[PDB]
Amino acid sequence: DRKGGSYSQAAGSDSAQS
Amino acid sequence: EIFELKAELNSDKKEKKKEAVKKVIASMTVGKDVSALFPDVVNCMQTDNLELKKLVYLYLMNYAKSQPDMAIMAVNTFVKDCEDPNPLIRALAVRTMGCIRVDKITEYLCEPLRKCLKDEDPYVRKTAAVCVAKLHDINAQLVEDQGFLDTLKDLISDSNPMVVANAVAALSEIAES
Amino acid sequence: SASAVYVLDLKGKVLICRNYRGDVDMSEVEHFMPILMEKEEEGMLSPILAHGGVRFMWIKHNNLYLVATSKKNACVSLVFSFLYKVVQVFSEYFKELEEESIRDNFVIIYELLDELMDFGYPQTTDSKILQEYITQEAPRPPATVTNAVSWRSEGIKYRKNEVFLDVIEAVNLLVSANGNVLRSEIVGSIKMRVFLSGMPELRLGLNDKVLFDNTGRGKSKSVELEDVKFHQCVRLSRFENDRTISFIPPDGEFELMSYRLNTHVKPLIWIESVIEKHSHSRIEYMVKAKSQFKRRSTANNVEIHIPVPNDADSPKFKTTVGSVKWVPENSEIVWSVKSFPGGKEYLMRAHFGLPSVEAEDKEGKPPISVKFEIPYFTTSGIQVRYLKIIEKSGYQALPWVRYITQNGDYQLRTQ
Amino acid sequence: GNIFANLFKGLFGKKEMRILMVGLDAAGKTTILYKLKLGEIVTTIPTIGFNVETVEYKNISFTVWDVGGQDKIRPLWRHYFQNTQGLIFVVDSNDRERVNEAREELMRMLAEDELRDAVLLVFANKQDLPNAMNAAEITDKLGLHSLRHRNWYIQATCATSGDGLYEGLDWLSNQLRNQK
Ligand SMILES: Nc1nc2c(ncn2[C@@H]2O[C@H](COP(=O)(O)OP(=O)(O)OP(=O)(O)O)[C@@H](O)[C@H]2O)c(=O)[nH]1
Ligand SMILES: [Mg+2]
Numbered sequence: 001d002r003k004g005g006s007y008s009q010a011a012g013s014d015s016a017q018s
Numbered sequence: 019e020i021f022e023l024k025a026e027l028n029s030d031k032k033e034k035k036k037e038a039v040k041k042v043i044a045s046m047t048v049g050k051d052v053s054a055l056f057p058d059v060v061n062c063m064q065t066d067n068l069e070l071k072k073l074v075y076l077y078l079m080n081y082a083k084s085q086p087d088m089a090i091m092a093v094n095t096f097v098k099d100c101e102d103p104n105p106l107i108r109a110l111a112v113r114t115m116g117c118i119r120v121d122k123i124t125e126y127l128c129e130p131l132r133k134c135l136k137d138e139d140p141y142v143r144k145t146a147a148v149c150v151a152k153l154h155d156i157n158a159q160l161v162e163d164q165g166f167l168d169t170l171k172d173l174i175s176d177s178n179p180m181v182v183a184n185a186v187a188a189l190s191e192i193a194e195s
Numbered sequence: 196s197a198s199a200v201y202v203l204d205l206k207g208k209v210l211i212c213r214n215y216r217g218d219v220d221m222s223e224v225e226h227f228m229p230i231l232m233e234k235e236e237e238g239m240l241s242p243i244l245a246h247g248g249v250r251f252m253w254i255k256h257n258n259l260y261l262v263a264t265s266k267k268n269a270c271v272s273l274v275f276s277f278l279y280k281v282v283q284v285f286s287e288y289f290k291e292l293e294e295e296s297i298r299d300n301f302v303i304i305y306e307l308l309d310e311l312m313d314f315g316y317p318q319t320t321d322s323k324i325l326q327e328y329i330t331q332e333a334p335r336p337p338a339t340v341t342n343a344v345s346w347r348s349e350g351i352k353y354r355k356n357e358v359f360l361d362v363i364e365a366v367n368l369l370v371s372a373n374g375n376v377l378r379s380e381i382v383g384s385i386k387m388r389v390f391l392s393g394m395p396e397l398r399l400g401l402n403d404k405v406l407f408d409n410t411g412r413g414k415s416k417s418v419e420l421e422d423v424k425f426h427q428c429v430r431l432s433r434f435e436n437d438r439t440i441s442f443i444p445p446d447g448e449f450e451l452m453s454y455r456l457n458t459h460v461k462p463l464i465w466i467e468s469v470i471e472k473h474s475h476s477r478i479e480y481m482v483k484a485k486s487q488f489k490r491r492s493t494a495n496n497v498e499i500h501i502p503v504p505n506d507a508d509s510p511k512f513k514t515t516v517g518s519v520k521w522v523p524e525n526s527e528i529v530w531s532v533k534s535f536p537g538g539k540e541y542l543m544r545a546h547f548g549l550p551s552v553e554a555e556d557k558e559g560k561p562p563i564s565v566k567f568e569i570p571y572f573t574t575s576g577i578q579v580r581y582l583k584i585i586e587k588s589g590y591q592a593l594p595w596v597r598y599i600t601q602n603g604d605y606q607l608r609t610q
Numbered sequence: 611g612n613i614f615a616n617l618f619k620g621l622f623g624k625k626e627m628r629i630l631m632v633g634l635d636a637a638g639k640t641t642i643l644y645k646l647k648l649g650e651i652v653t654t655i656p657t658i659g660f661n662v663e664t665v666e667y668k669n670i671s672f673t674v675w676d677v678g679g680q681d682k683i684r685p686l687w688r689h690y691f692q693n694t695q696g697l698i699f700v701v702d703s704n705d706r707e708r709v710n711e712a713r714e715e716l717m718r719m720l721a722e723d724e725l726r727d728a729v730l731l732v733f734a735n736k737q738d739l740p741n742a743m744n745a746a747e748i749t750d751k752l753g754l755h756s757l758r759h760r761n762w763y764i765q766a767t768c769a770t771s772g773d774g775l776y777e778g779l780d781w782l783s784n785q786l787r788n789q790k
Contacts, residue, residue, distance in 0.1 A: 003495060004570035004599035007359060011581035013400055017410055028693055040302060047211060047301055061689055064662050068333045072306055083217075091686055094659030094678075105335045106328065113313050119217050126658065140341035141318075148313040155216070155314075178341060180318075187316050 024058050035062055039073045046080065056081040060091045064098065068107065071099070075114040082118045089118065093126045100130040105139045112145035116152030124153050128164045135169045140178030147173060147181065151188035155195065167192070196269020196315050197252065200281065200308070202297060203227070203260040210259050210297035213308040215315045218266045219249050227251045227262055243271065254278050257292035269315065280320045281311060287322040288331070303331035321345055323446060346428040347394040347443035356391035358444065358584075360596025364574060366567075367604030368462045372560075376462065381575060382603065383420060383454025389444035391584075391592060398583020399429075399440030399451060402576075406438050418577025420454030441583070460574065462605070463488040464535070464567050466499050470610055475553060478504055480545025482530060486537045488569060492600070494535035498566035502527040502609065503547070505558045510547030517541055527561075535567060562606035572600035623669035627786045630728065631661065632687055632719060633700020634712035635679030638735030641769035642700065643676040646779070651770055658683060660690065667779055670787065674698065684715060691725050696786060698731035698778075701752065703742040713752050720757065729785040730754055730762025733778055737768035761785045 026038040042059070046052045056077065063074045082089045099111040112134055115127045131153060134146035150170060154161030161167070170192070173185030198219030201212030207228035212221065223246050231253070234240030244251035244262070252274055253262035261278050282292075284307065289296040297304070306329050311319050319325055319340065327337045327348070339348050363386060369378030389397070400406075404419030425434055426442065426449060433439035440452065465487045471479020482501050488494065497517070503510065505526050512519035516539065517532030530543055584592040616624075633639040640657055644650065647663040660683070661676030675694070677687045699716045702708050716732075719725060734748050749755060749764035763781045767774035 002597070004568070004601075005362070005597040006571065007595035007597045010360065010579055010594045010596050011400075013398060013581035013583050014410075015581075017412075043301060043305070044298075047298075057689065069302065072309070073302070076305055076309070090682060091659050091689070094657055094661070097655065097658070106333055109336070110309070113309065116314065117217070139336070141336045144318055145313070148316065148318075152216075152314050179343065180340065180345070184316065184318065188314075191316075 020055065024055060027055070027058050027062050032065075032067065035065070036067070036070055039070055039077075042077065043073055046077070052077070053081045053084040056085050057088045057091075060088060063092065063095050068104075071107070072110060075110060079114055079117045082120055082123070086120055086122075089120050089123060093123065096127065097130060100134060105142055108134065108137070108139075109141050109145040112142070112149045116149035119156065121157075124156060124160060127153070128160070131166070132164065135166065140181040143173065143178050143181035144184040147185040147188045151191050154188075154192045158192075158195070161192070196267055197263035197265040197274045197277070198249065198315070200261065200263040200278065200312070202256070203253070203262050204294060204297075205258060209262075210294060211301060211304055211308070213305065215312055216266075219264045223249055223251065223264055224262060227253065227260075227264075231260075252278075254282070256282065258294055259297065277312060277317045280317065281308075284311070284320075284322050284325055288326065300331050303329060306333075323348060344394065344428075344443055346426075346445050346449075348446055349394050351392060351394070351446055353390060353392040356395075356584075356590055356592045358387050358389040358391060358582075358592065358594040360385065360387040360579075360582075360594065362573070362579075362596060362598035364572070364598070364600040365603030366458070366463055366574065366600065367602075368458075368606070369604065370462070370607040372608040372610050378604070379458045379462070380604075381456065381458040383418070383452075383456075383575065383577070384450065385452040385454070385579075386448060386450045387444065387594070387596070388448040389446070389594075391444075391586075392590065393586045393588060394443050395584050395586045395592070397440075397442055397444040397451070398581070398585065399442075400580040400583065402578045402580055403438065409438065416576040416578070418454065418575045419456060420577075421456035423455070424453050426451045444584075454575070454577070456575075458574075461487045463569065463574065463600070463602070464494065464497070464499070464565055464605070466563065466565060466607055468501060468563060468607070468610065472504070473549070475549050475551060478507055478510075478545065478547050478549060480528065480543060482543040482545065484530065484539075484541040484543075484565075486535060486539045488537040488572065488574075490537040492537045492569045492572040494537070494567040494569040495533070496566065496568055497530075497532040497535035499530040499532075500525070500527050500564050500566070501530060501543075501545070502561045502563060503545070504549060506550050506554055507547045508550070510545060512543065512545055514543035515541055517543075519543060519545075529566075535569070537569070560609040562608050564604075564606040565602050567605070568599070568601035570597070570599045573598050574600055625669070625787055625789075626671040626673075627783060628695040629665075629672045629674040629782055630690065630694055630697040630731070631674045631676035631700070632698060632715075633677075633679055633733075633735070634702050634705070634708050634715060636705065636708075637679060637700035637702040637712065638733070638767070638769040639679070639698075639700035640676055642698075642733060642735065642767060642775065643674050645769065645772055645775055646672075646674060649772070651772075656680065660686065665779070668783055670783060672696075672779065672782065672786075679712075679715070687719065688722075691722065694725070695728060696731065696782060697725055697728035698733065698782070700735050701732055701748055702736055703734055703748055704736035704739055709751065716752065720760065726759075729782075730757055730760045731778070731782055731785075732762060732764050733774075734764065734766035735769065737766045737774065738770050742766070 023038050026034045042052050102108050131149055137143050150166040170185050170189045174182050198216045199214035202210040204210050209224050230244055249266045251262050251264045253260040263274050324340050363384030365382045367380050368376050370376045402417045404417035407413040407417040429442040433441045465485035467483045469481025510521050517530050521528045582594050631639050631643045646665040657678030664671050664673035675690045745764045745766050754762040765778040
């Protein structure tokens, strides 16, 4: 764990925007 | 102290010369008038080590106005260093040539400035532009005679965009004065 | 266009100086200290000094004043930017900014100063680039500086491609003594610590209000930052054209984007203070803190600083949640709380005596500021859509990002 | 004390020796130094300051400090006179007008008490034209035979050809080193 918010995975781009 | 430092600088040991140079640099930064030892360090100037060359150049720049007469024994060293294969050495030599406030020193540095004006290295080009701007600020007539305005203007329309920006800044500074 | 940039000391001694133009004598640094002393004693002290026809612009450093003397009408903003870059380079190279490192790395410090700027025009400003050519423990200059991409060094190889982002949120609230918030602005901070192989070009994508409106998806929760500043590697052309945040990520921790817009929502922590101060008899601290944030978010390390009397002594704290410690150096009592869950209501009752002799002069009413920091909270509601990591060789990246909410200029005016 | 390390160093060669490069301008001193160090006739700009180089021959690194013959560089030869064990004078047999100036400079250099342990080293430079004198006429004109307490030898060396440089180096080594 880590203070200030756990790290979260990020996507590559807006998949719904084509 | 001074005698021991002079003896160490007049030796053939690289470690002793480096220690003497470091001691002289520390004394100069601490507020010690080390300009009296400038002629002694003139002989120990052409050294293969880059760390000692930078310290020698800094001492000459800081001891050029104090001892302009003793600065005449560094034109050959500057000319030799202006053709160094290492771009860092050439840039340091160009910066030191323009940083030396000697009326008779910049006259003999016009040829090195012209040679480094067309340097392919963008860092070398920026150093040459800075040296040309410094020479023009010190002597506008000398810069005009050397014809560095055309070289500075053409540097804007070339590659090395950082070098182009440096040349543009140098041209603006020349036109500002 | 400073004539020479030098580093001073707390006693007026110049730790290190390096002339760049030679148009200003080095002896002008001695008169800088008396001028600063006179300005401080008369209230006219300014960062940009003026010694006759030569201006000695100085910046208050950690331990020395970075005085950059200038002679002509040089760019003051340019001089300030150069000083900031030099300070950042020194901080990167030396972990401590004091006299201990000023006189300990003079051999490399002089070389770094010479390489940074020449003739008053800075040339090298990248910490990585400067470290790749000048070290304290020399080869040719790197091609990255000469090349267009000066913020992403090529040839970097790593075992794994992991990038750690940080969604830093600064909640600044300017609540006047009347109980109304005057300055309520939240400044975003999108800083990513990219550590991968090669020179990937990051394709930043978030739930931006402008981007959502342009794409026709302006119906969900979108963050509309009033001021958005891109990093050095961020291409301004793509952002101006279609808001495309495409740039080469740097090697290490760097600030890609920093949102800055006003906040129209209620404060995360609502603190009401009561001052039952008797006339040289006693003092009352009726401080009540209300958590306006969501109950699912906890404000870790919340420290609501309540300024106590300057001459107050023998204070007693009667609170409910959170330890209260009076620091004589700070002349205030901070309502420190380890964990502050949202919706919590903490009530405190301070009581301390006062000296019989009245104070000769007033001490003012400094504003009360809190140090609340609740991570994993997105007050602005801006959610990152995707991060386009593309490499010429081709690799599968695993970027990560964390949202941190803290208290910035959250000062409440005293009664 | 023990001198085992000194004997071990001297068994395989430890002596280096020293040398000086002085003379009139355009007298082949720079060319002679380049031939000693590199071995080729390379065209170079006049030596405004000084040239420092070392040549290793016979297991001895005889470093030669070239000094220009310029008016502004002629008085600068005193800086290299400190901690100097050798002195080489460059003669210009093809410059009759500058022959007197070169002789005066050599006499001034040899008329110093500091430069007393360095033997005379006169090289007949410009030995490529018929106007060049022999090894005895140059010495007689320069008065090297009357220089008592100085080991001065007249040697003819041509910069373009390179002949005679080995003889001068051997003479300098014999003057400096007197061992087997
Ligand atoms: N072409 C040619 N030049 C010779 C010959 N012998 C001597 N020289 C001279 O050697 C000079 C070489 O110049 P430098 O390399 O600068 O050496 P220097 O003679 O000491 O001149 P300075 O360094 O300026 O003092 C030429 O200028 C010639 O005058 C020779 O046989 N052929
Ligand atoms: Mg020569």
